[PDB]
Design a protein around this ligand. Structure first.
Ligand code: NAP
Ligand code: NAP
Ligand code: CL
Lengths: 222, 220
């Protein structure tokens, strides 16, 4: 197993950290301030989740990234650059950075829109801000539940995408995705293909409304 | 059998016009200038005689006589094509919008304009407020719009976006007649944003898979 740092204490971070730990990886979870995160009483609260996953350990973004071989970005999209900067470019250099964030924009009305979008992407922004990291955009196109148990929606009949400049990095991420139950991994190409992957979110949001559930997924039929 | 006007002489317009004529509809195909179009270089002049029931005429002349109108024009020019068709000829009728507002001004692959906070489907609806705009079929290759069974046995999804639920219901019936068994109503015309925004990944999937013979399926 690998030493994996999951930056994010929300549903995605918890879901991924728990699943990766169950697969035999040594998993740490990154947060801005561990004391503040553990002190949160409002919901569930992170302090109620952590005791159920005894093999997972909490620390600040910089501390978890420095100790990990591979890093997973599961932070709020609008804050991902800030989170990763706090993690430290020096702690990301030469390592695979799995980017699951969506750059949702909740500033000017509902449902959210994307920023950046179309001619740019959060995946690209992360890669050019941290040029020595090996960014792989993946898993952002489905509900957290399906990232680790895709079988819950239509017997696991679905597609997952990878985007990234380093083919060897994408191959390693594909192996991890397969270990999580994803049998159809499609390589969209370089990191600029994160634009199309991120741009699936607007229809995802409308499908959630139209279908009355987040238990659905995209399948590329061919 | 409805009177359908298909605005567009490219692969989408030809494919849709031919399929609808084969289904029993009285189909007309719209172009800017019939004389100029037939004078080109397969060429439209060779396609047209193979579909004798389909009639070619100017945009304004096909829309006036039609009961339902299909937009199959270049996305960047759709507002101009429909303006030429005439707002008076679109009033009270279903306007099926298949166009994608691809933007080729800054190289390849194309991006979208409008995008994100706006869509071509919305632009069309607010420019022609009395038309009943329904965004659909823009998310797949022309071949699959009329014969979806060609890709993975037809296991795919098609979307409808539009403000008028009765208009969407009529379009859903037409889509079913074309072989689309899974029609998903995304909601109002602003949901055309998500439908149009599937194109960037579509373009990369075409490159990644080496074929246009694929489709989106929403598994649930
Ligand atoms: N919800 C889903 O099922 C789903 C599906 C696909 C993709 N995504 C994407 O996955 C990401 C995570 O979503 P989520 O719902 O689990 O959590 P989230 O609420 O979007 O993000 C919470 C995390 O972001 C960090 N964060 C928030 N503001 C920050 C800032 N100012 N500076 C640095 N870090 C900040 C938090 O740090 P602290 O720990 O210190 O609070 C926390 O770790 C998002 O980008 C989302 O769009 C979510
Ligand atoms: N290719 C596909 O399988 C596919 C799939 C899904 C959606 N779409 C969308 O479907 C639409 C049609 O695509 P296409 O490849 O069949 O044809 P296209 O090349 O995009 O469009 C050709 C049509 O647009 C009209 N047009 C071009 N410039 C115009 C202008 N300045 N003013 C008025 N009309 C103008 C042409 O008029 P004339 O007849 O006078 O030349 C012609 O009828 C596009 O929006 C495209 O994005 C295509
Ligand atoms: Cl554990």
């Amino acid at each position: 197993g690998m030493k994996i740092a999951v930056l994010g204490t929300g549903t995605v971070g918890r879901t991924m950290a728990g699943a990766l730990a169950d697969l035999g990886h040594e998993v740490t979870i990154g947060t801005r301030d561990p004391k503040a995160t553990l002190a949160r009483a409002e919901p569930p609260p992170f302090s109620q989740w952590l005791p159920e996953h005894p093999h997972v350990h909490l620390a600040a973004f910089a501390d978890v990234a420095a100790g990990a071989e591979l890093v997973v970005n599961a932070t709020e999209g609008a804050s991902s650059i800030a989170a990763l900067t706090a993690a430290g470019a020096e702690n990301l250099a030469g390592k695979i950075l799995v980017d699951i964030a969506n750059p949702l924009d909740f500033s000017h009305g509902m449902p959210p829109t994307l920023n950046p979008v179309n001619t740019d992407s959060l995946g690209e922004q992360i890669q050019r801000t941290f040029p020595e990291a090996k960014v792989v955009k993946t898993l952002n196109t489905m509900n957290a539940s399906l990232m680790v148990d895709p079988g819950r929606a239509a017997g696991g009949d679905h597609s997952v995408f990878v985007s990234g400049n380093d083919a060897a990095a994408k191959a390693e991420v594909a192996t991890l995705l397969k270990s999580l139950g994803h049998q159809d991994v499609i390589d969209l190409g370089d990191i600029t293909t994160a634009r199309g992957a991120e741009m699936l979110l607007p229809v995802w949001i409308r499908l959630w409304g139209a279908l009355g559930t987040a238990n659905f997924n995209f399948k590329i039929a061919r």
